[PDB]
């Protein structure tokens, strides 16, 4: 069986640059390579077949080249919708095989988060729990810190965070931080603040609401 090696595993590039993904086979396979694109939670989508043949639907930015054991997928002028994993696959000899994949990542201009704090819903409270949600949105670069303070005093219990992968609308990143207590515990405090620390400002961006 044919081993297909994809390098590099991660490919960071700047908007509009020409970018190239490699796929090396473990023996000569003519031009029987095909390239697929898989966005975050998408299914895969054929981009190029038989190494260089265009598909309809696909921007002409995308081309492919190579034959034998070395193949390249290239994108003329990368842009946000291109953020994805890219796979190669061979039909030269049985079984068909896939490469391990390369992720495209676009270095964009720095951007500061847009923060938004959200009280629990009255629907939620009814059932005997309370979650406060902070959204740290459309920032670059991906590294960021979120701090929770209750009535001036930092809390660390009951916090879950989740970060999105780079976004195909604008190459930014986003994050949600979710603070979860009982009604009991949410009742005996006044002021919740989500604080956000990010490269773009020396001052944190802070967002707060009060129940009273």
């Amino acid at each position: 069986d044919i081993l297909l090696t994809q390098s590099p595993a991660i490919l960071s590039v700047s908007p509009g640059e020409r970018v190239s993904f490699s796929c090396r086979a473990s023996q000569s396979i003519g031009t029987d390579i095909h390239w697929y694109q898989q966005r975050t939670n998408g299914s895969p989508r054929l981009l190029i077949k038989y190494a260089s043949e265009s598909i309809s639907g696909i921007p002409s930015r995308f081309s492919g080249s190579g034959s034998g054991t070395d193949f390249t997928l290239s994108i003329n002028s990368v842009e946000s919708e291109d953020i994805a994993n890219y796979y190669c696959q061979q039909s030269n000899r049985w079984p068909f095989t896939f490469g391990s994949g390369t992720k495209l990542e676009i270095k964009r201009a720095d951007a500061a988060p847009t923060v938004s704090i959200f009280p629990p819903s009255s629907e939620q409270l009814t059932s005997g729990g309370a979650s406060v949600v902070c959204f740290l949105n459309n920032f670059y670069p991906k590294d960021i810190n979120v701090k929770w303070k209750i009535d001036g005093s930092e809390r660390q219990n009951g916090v879950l965070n989740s970060w999105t992968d780079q976004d195909s609308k604008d190459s930014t990143y986003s994050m949600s931080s979710t603070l979860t207590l009982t009604k009991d515990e949410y009742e005996r405090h006044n002021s919740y603040t989500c604080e956000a620390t990010h490269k773009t400002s020396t001052s944190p961006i802070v967002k707060s609401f009060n129940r009273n």
């Binding site: 895969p44 039909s91 068909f96 959200f118 949600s176």
Partner: protein, 219 residues
Amino acid sequence: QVQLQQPGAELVKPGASVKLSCKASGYTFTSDWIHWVKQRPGHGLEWIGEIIPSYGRANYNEKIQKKATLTADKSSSTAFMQLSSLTSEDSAVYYCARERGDGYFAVWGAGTTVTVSSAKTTPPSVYPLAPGSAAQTNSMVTLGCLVKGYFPEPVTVTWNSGSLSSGVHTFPAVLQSDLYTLSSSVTVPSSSWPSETVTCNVAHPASSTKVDKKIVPRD
């Protein structure tokens, strides 16, 4: 039209066994092959096997433990993969795709998230997130809604059932004590809210739910 149709989800118990389905539309040839492809989370694609329906001959990846058995009903244009005696290893999105016998996968299903757990299905609770009256605003406003206490994955989340797509973030679920939870953001111009309605629709195929939830301001 959607050429290949697969269930969003299936839960299975350790040692138990499941039958995934892949139904096809559009140009069917008797020379067509249906393939199955496994993708464990944050991993790559792994060819599992293929079948040619107009016959019933099937071949499998020999490089892996053989969990699969492929079959087809040529009458209903459906292909089936019997995954048997699963473990948590076997939890993954399984796609089906169609290859016209010329070696590439023109067309793919959306795939079935298969979760192998002792745990129990739980529909999701949904809750608005409109902002507090203290919060001031820009030329844009961010609303959102919070999907929690569900199992197994996945859920899909829409904003006005497809029409609102620019400005949307759904975050990855986080699992804690056997229930997943997540939130989804949306950002409209402030002048379009709340005059123009804004609603988060939320599908959870493992319990067959699908609940809308409007986002009004806070009383």
